[PDB]
Structure 1
Amino acid sequence: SSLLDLIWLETILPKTTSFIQMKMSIMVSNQKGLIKLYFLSFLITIMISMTLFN
């Protein structure tokens, strides 16, 4: 009941996936909305697409 069903079966599939998605959402949406920053990101993306794509 406690060790398997309530702890580890909850930890493997639903809790770990939820934690990963929450961390990724925080990382993605933690932007400060600075045009300089994301235009520099645009420049990096442009260079990567021009060079490492054949």
Structure 2
Amino acid sequence: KSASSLLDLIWLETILPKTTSFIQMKMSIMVSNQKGLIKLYFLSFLITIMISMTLFNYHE
């Protein structure tokens, strides 16, 4: 109950492998689930234009 199961088969596998795999889980479906509407893509171009232009001020 302490060496096996809880430590090896519960804890260490949860922390490095499973937690990172779950991070990739949660950030793959919020990254690659866009419907395909040209609008929202183009406003993504939009706010990026100012963030590059004035907010960060890349040129400055």
Structure 1 runs (4+) deviating above 4 angstroms are none
Deviation, 1:52, is: 2.3
Percent identity of equivalent pairs: 100
Deviation, 1:53, is: 3.0
TM-score normalised over the length of structure 1: 0.93
Q: Which structure has more helix as a fraction of its residues?
A: 1
- Larger C-alpha radius of gyration, 1 or 2? 2
The runs of 5 or more residues in structure 1 that have no matched partner are none
TM-score normalised over the length of structure 2: 0.84
Query: Once superposed, what is the RMSD of the aligned Cα atoms?
Result: 0.8
Aligned residues: 54
- Cα distance between partner residues in 2 of 1:39 and 1:20: 27
- Cα distance between partner residues in 2 of 1:11 and 1:22: 14
